[PDB]
Design a binder for this molecule. Structure first.
Ligand SMILES: Nc1ccn([C@@H]2O[C@H](COP(=O)(O)OP(=O)(O)OP(=O)(O)O)[C@@H](O)[C@H]2F)c(=O)n1
Ligand SMILES: Nc1ccn([C@@H]2O[C@H](COP(=O)(O)OP(=O)(O)OP(=O)(O)O)[C@@H](O)[C@H]2F)c(=O)n1
Ligand SMILES: Nc1ccn([C@@H]2O[C@H](COP(=O)(O)OP(=O)(O)OP(=O)(O)O)[C@@H](O)[C@H]2F)c(=O)n1
Lengths: 533, 533, 533
């Protein structure tokens, strides 16, 4: 059976929720038994987001295969069960890097290498690579139509539509239909001007997704249908919602998936959105409420912790607990003290690099441990837990990571090559999914309810096994290990209601439907702490 | 004093002669005592033309510093005395390569790298690097305004004009004003639509250069002046000409250089175009005529030998000889025989790579030597001369280059590392200007009238010094050497009216005003041969 | 029965021959037995060309129904037998007049009247009115796509194509593919940019008609086919031709009519162009040559006499005579005398208004009559012939028209209301087709071979019947009359080889295939005169 492509573009503004719209539609199509995947084309020149700052870009999402990707692939995995890889995200940078590699090598046989056809060919090849073997492929084009940065992507998908044909390709264009107080109506003029930009570069939209702060009435949808020459049922209202989990239902209620299946001649049963209806019900009917402090160094952009924030929400769903997430700057802990950590039912220290704000995170880990406040440390969160325990229980003065203090006496965290003890004696970037072995009688062995788990890494600095035994003797427990080097993956403080810290990023395998054993356990502990007060 | 920039763009069609127009204007400004330079921005993705085929792109021009550049830099050096370097030519490929290098390295400090401002910043930086330190910098933008490939270049120069100001920047736009038989007039409508494209990307043209197959009358120039909102004296007619040497005079006669000097507030004397008037006079008043056969493997695109064709014309000027250049396919010599080399007053075998057509060039060199027909071999032309002499005089059976027959018994041409004799015994890409030492009592020592010369290389395969002495004993003379390895640069056949072959590319230092000693000597010999018949 | 529409647009330049191309294609379709018509949409604000000067816009063409139309309707009637009416030509001025009339009287029921939908609706209504009841309707859109003046027309026909559908509508776009000497090739870049402007206003061309001064090769046509996403058979080469009569054959040979009949599902036999082949043959093979002087007051624009020039050519075809048309300014006859009328085989005085140059035409008529030089007078040409005969034979001194000298003693030409005799005693704009009664034994009765004819008028001033009988008695013969007032339509001078003058415009009923009895007779007399000299 022929692979079908839905090209997802945006007009008027960038922040239309193209990713959430594509992911929500993919969820409906998957619920009709279709094999669906999603792909993100980013017009930035960065070869990948591995270099990009969290406070500039948002979180770097990590796929099972260890690709560093746009946080949109987090949306994709949280809406469909089709696993994302390197093939589901590429940048203009990646395209030019690969064309330049081929050109300098001599693969173009002395030809003049051109934006058309060579850059556009490279784009089409990567879309086909990610798409072929699926029933429906949703291809999200980053940027706003009319901008120069996305012109090669738009010319590439235009060519694909000509080659493949209108029987197996659709153009789904998101647009802003803004409300004006003065007119007391939503305005289609920006959609008119955006669609004109699309037409000028040879793309006719099949579907209009009308974004607004309210319902786009039938009268306005009728206007858009006429000026775009599309059926009225191909013009969809997507108002601002309190919950993205409702979007699949909102799109299905307007028959969007029916129109797509008709256009692609797909005979498949009606979408059963029971799993999404259940998530919505859970969210709408909490039994109790908690306040969880997230203490990190990137809080100035919450999207720096996108998957962690969603993982905490999923933890809420599974416990019927409403989670109030309080973003706390770890540097404020360094200046103002532990005063700002008061009135928290639990504390989460997420991932990060560089020494800025790390001492505040160590103080935060100490506060949580000493005051029996539920604690979850992720990557850097595990480091500061180990450092806290090394310093203040195992009596290892000024214990630190070689990342922060390279020549510290007790490098309890360090690169495998840097591993040394306090006497200077020695022995004779991990990305993606890896198996972790859980230790018998550990909290995580119970929570995960399995002897082995698979979680995703994005880190280079490990627990120093040369200084580990001393910290173990001081009472800290190793709950998880991995590989031949038996690298520490999970640590637990036993004399504590709930204290867990892991090297891997569990937030990347959390979904609203399936939740996550660790976050479910964490939020449950937060609820139990709140009740005890 | 502030550096002034003239941005040279083209509309309607690619082949307007933007390079020749920029070069011709530069010649006028240089003749007014101004320090002028020219720069070419190519929108192709090739990092440089080093990979690009001659039959696709045209000749690879080599600057003194050994940069492989667009043939436009040949136009530039043939019109102004300001020496070109790597700084006078760059591609989109070069820009992206440098931005990606910086990005992967981490110079953007975790920022999202964007077409604007990061690609445009990289373009502006390279324009400033090539421009600063000159009175006037002409910046030629490759492509046709309205195409996506040149949009980043156009946004970059738009920003430069805002920053620098209209006191020290001008937009000079070439346009096609085509004649229609039906209307019996030249048509400004394409100029109207092209200027609209310029305005849409934020550029207002200051000067319109109107290209046509005839004069653009004052009435039509008046129409263009009004719709562009420029003075009538800023609208220039540049009709098709029989000689590009006339273009400086044609532009000066319409006061283009006066307008530029007024806009840039440059107080400089009137242009004395006597040197160009003399070139025009020489060209228009030849005394005799010759037919010179150019026997190569890229004749399907004459621009493959652009600088060689111009060098032969310059040889004509200095001798008052009209040169009829007959392009002959060396593969036709292999199939049809030496029949197709009849009625030639001289034979030139130019540069090339790969074995295709080389045996035809060896046969051509043999024909010229045996029939006492003046011969000039350039690079590959020298190889086939050495091979011919090795085989047919020094009795070295099947003598060849390791490039063509790697395991041949007599590798008379080979890489320095491959150098071996006929017994297999051994000893215990050159680009740009290098000094060559000329041998006493050689033809070239007389022609160049100096013991040392500087010429430009583009080759990797050398004369094998291990097999050289045997060929010397057979009567071939070494006329030029270079470096510590004493690599053979020039060879001569003594018992011949004029037989010279060189490793370097003398065509790259030939100009219409100064000519070239070697090409002047070659065309003189062609004339003397013609008279003898 | 469903009516099919071919929308004919032009890009790059105005003077593509959109009318000749539309008319030529119509001729092929008519030769397949199809009922075809053509209409011209003119973007000028003139309600009609009734006001527009001959020396600015060219001849006012008169249809049977007495509409004053664009000279393109002359092309239409010379290529197809379908009669043009007021319905086959309208301007922007007509459309705005239509809408303003409806608005002021209150047909829009207090609605805001808008370019869309009210102006576009008015355009569509007139296109349907002219089109319905035909197999194929060719709709020529005046102007160049990308200009603001034609935007409402282009939006109107865009809407029609959506309503009617691609099964019964086609967009045929003429484009300029200009030759550049520099590249030695025709350039598709203007077509690329023109088609983008078409796409931007929501029109995708089906057929590309490629205009150039030479054949557009298959390689360039293939390039255009790909970038336009049309079949290669939908890209047509239409080079400059020496005869417009060849264009139907040239379009047929590339199968354009086959493609149109396929797209519209029209099963019709092959085009029989035998009549066009005959016209081409006749034109190419003249037996003899004649010089015919056209003495008028609008010669500064030949298009002022478009249909008269074509009628003289058609006279040539039917006699196998090459007609050298010498345009002579009648004012030069006034200043330089009858010297400038020497070396003419025949004299034609065409239509005109106002006194400027009329005395020169009267002198011209006298010269032709006295020297027995074949004479054909049309409208004003009949007036001056009557004035000549009145003055110089009937001895009516200073005889004139009331248009020129209102108070003249002998107003031999005057409005019916002004009719008076020499003593001042009294009795008691004609547009379109009218029956004229031909007098027995007259030359015109013999040539037309019918007692009655139908010819078209555009005049105000009649022959004064009160002064007629005195001119008749002096030898002049009335050859044709019309109406109840027995108005003089044709006069003849008996003692002369060929002297005819008519009130009506016979040039409007002349075609290359059928010729015209008066013009055929006139050119025959010119050849017979040339033989005698
Ligand atoms: N390509 C176009 C399309 C339309 N028009 C003009 O546009 C006017 C209505 O334009 P309005 O902003 O008043 O109302 P609307 O379009 O429904 O847009 P909105 O309220 O939903 O935002 C109307 O006279 C029409 F002539 C145009 O000139 N050129
Ligand atoms: N942005 C523009 C500019 C002009 N126009 C229209 O353009 C018409 C003349 O357009 P023409 O091709 O006949 O003559 P031209 O322009 O002198 O061009 P050319 O012969 O030198 O090629 C004229 O009615 C004017 F209304 C337009 O609609 N939109
Ligand atoms: N929307 C477009 C379309 C094309 N391009 C660029 O256009 C270059 C060839 O452009 P050329 O004038 O050399 O050749 P051509 O197109 O065949 O036109 P012609 O000779 O028939 O007139 C080529 O690198 C391609 F990348 C563009 O940037 N934007």
């Amino acid at each position: 059976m022929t692979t079908n492509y839905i090209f997802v573009t945006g007009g008027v503004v960038s922040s239309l929720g193209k990713g959430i719209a594509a992911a929500s539609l993919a969820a409906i199509l998957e619920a009709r038994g279709l094999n669906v995947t999603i792909m993100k084309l980013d017009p930035y020149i960065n070869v990948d987001p591995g270099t990009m700052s969290p406070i500039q870009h948002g979180e770097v999402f990590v796929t099972e295969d260890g690709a560093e990707t746009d946080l949109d692939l987090g949306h994709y995995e949280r809406f469909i069960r089709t696993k994302m890889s390197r093939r589901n995200n590429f940048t203009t940078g990646r395209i030019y890097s690969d064309v330049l590699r081929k050109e300098r090598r001599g693969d173009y046989l002395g030809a003049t290498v051109q934006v058309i056809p060579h850059i556009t060919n490279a784009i089409k090849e990567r879309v086909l690579e990610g798409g072929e073997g699926h029933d429906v492929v949703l291809v999200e084009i980053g940027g706003t139509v009319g901008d120069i940065e996305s012109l090669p992507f738009l010319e590439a998908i235009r060519q694909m539509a000509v080659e493949i044909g209108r029987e197996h390709t659709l153009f789904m264009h998101l647009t802003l239909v803004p409300y004006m107080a003065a007119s007391g109506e939503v305005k289609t003029k920006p959609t008119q001007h955006s669609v004109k930009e699309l037409l000028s570069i040879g793309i006719q939209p099949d579907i209009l997704i009308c974004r607004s702060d309210r319902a786009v009435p039938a009268n306005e949808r009728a206007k858009i249908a006429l000026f775009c020459n599309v059926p009225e049922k191909a013009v969809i209202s997507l108002k601002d919602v309190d919950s993205i989990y409702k979007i699949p239902g909102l799109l299905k209620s307007q028959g969007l998936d029916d129109y797509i299946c008709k256009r692609f001649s797909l005979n498949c049963p009606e979408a059963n959105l029971s799993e999404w209806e259940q998530v919505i019900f859970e969210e709408a009917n909490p039994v109790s409420e908690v306040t969880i402090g997230m203490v990190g160094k990137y809080i100035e952009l919450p999207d720096a912790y996108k998957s962690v924030i969603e993982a905490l929400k999923h933890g809420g769903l599974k416990n019927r607990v409403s989670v109030n997430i309080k973003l706390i700057d770890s540097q404020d802990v360094e200046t103002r003290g532990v005063e700002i950590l008061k009135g928290l039912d639990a504390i989460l220290v997420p991932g990060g690099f560089g020494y800025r704000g790390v001492e505040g995170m160590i103080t935060t880990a100490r506060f949580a441990r000493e005051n029996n406040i539920p604690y979850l440390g992720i990557c850097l969160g595990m480091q500061v837990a180990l450092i806290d325990y090394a310093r203040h229980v195992a009596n290892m003065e000024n214990a630190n990571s070689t990342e922060f203090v390279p020549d510290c006496k007790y490098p309890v965290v360090a690169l495998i090559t840097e591993w040394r003890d306090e006497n200077g004696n020695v022995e004779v970037m991990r990305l993606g999914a890896q198996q972790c072995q859980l230790v018998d009688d550990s909290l995580v062995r119970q929570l995960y309810n399995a002897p082995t788990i698979v979680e995703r890494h994005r880190h280079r600095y490990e627990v120093n096994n040369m200084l580990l035994k001393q910290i173990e003797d001081a009472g800290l427990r190793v709950a998880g290990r991995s590989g031949d080097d038996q690298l520490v993956e999970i640590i637990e403080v036993p004399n504590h209601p709930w204290f867990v810290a892991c090297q891997f990023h569990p937030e990347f395998t959390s979904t609203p439907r399936d939740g996550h054993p660790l976050f479910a356990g964490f939020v449950k502990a937060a609820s139990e702490f709140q009740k005890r007060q």
